[PDB]
Amino acid sequence: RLLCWSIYVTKKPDQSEEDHHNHVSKVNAPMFIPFLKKYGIVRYTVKHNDAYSKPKQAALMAGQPEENVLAYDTVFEIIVKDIESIQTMQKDEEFLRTTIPDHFNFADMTRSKGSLTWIEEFTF
C-alpha cells in the first residue's frame, strides 16, 4: 500500500490568489522537490483551486450550494511507500532551514488541514 500525505492549504490572509499560486509553483516547488527526491517520495502533486480552474468547477457543480466545494487554495500531496520517508525528511537540516520556513510565504497554517491515507491507484 502506497500512502498519500495531503495538506489542504488556505493561503495567507493578506495574499492574493495570483501571489499565492505564483509562489507555490515558481518558488516553493523548486525549493521543495530536491528533498522529496532525496527521501524517495514517489510523486508530488499540487492541486490549485484558482482563476484557471474555478470556472470549470462552477461548470461541473452548478446548481449545488457553494458549500459543497472544498475550497482550499492549494492541496499538497506526496505519495510515499512509508511515513519514515517523511519523518526522516523532516529531520533534514537544510529542509528545516530553507523549505519549512518558506511556508511563511503562502500557507496559513491556522486554516489548513492534513490527511494521511493509503491509496489504490489505476492508471489508464
Which residue ranges make up the site for a copy of itself (CB under 8 A)? 1, 3-6, 8, 25, 29, 33, 36-37, 40-50, 52-54, 56-57, 59-61, 64, 67-72, 75, 83, 86-87, 112-124
Helix, coil or strand: residue 92: coil
Binds 13: which of a copy of itself, ligand A1EAB, none (CB < 5-8 Å by kind):
none
CB-nearer residue toward ligand A1EAB: 38 or 103: 103
Instruction: Return the closest-CA partner of residue 73 out of 100, 45, 54, 101.
Output: 54
Locate 49 and state its grid cell. 483551486
* Phi, psi (degrees; rounded to nearest 5) at 40: 70, 30
Q: Point out which span in 65-73, 77-85, 94-102, 116-124 binds ligand A1EAB (CB under 6 A).
A: 94-102
Binds 8: which of ligand A1EAB, a copy of itself, none (CB < 5-8 Å by kind):
a copy of itself
Binds 104: which of a copy of itself, ligand A1EAB, none (CB < 5-8 Å by kind):
none
Number of C-alpha atoms within 13 angstroms, CB side, residue 40? Answer: 9
Residue type, 61: M
Q: Is 72 in the site for ligand A1EAB (CB under 6 A)?
A: no
Q: Which helix (H) or strand (E) holds 31?
A: helix 29-38
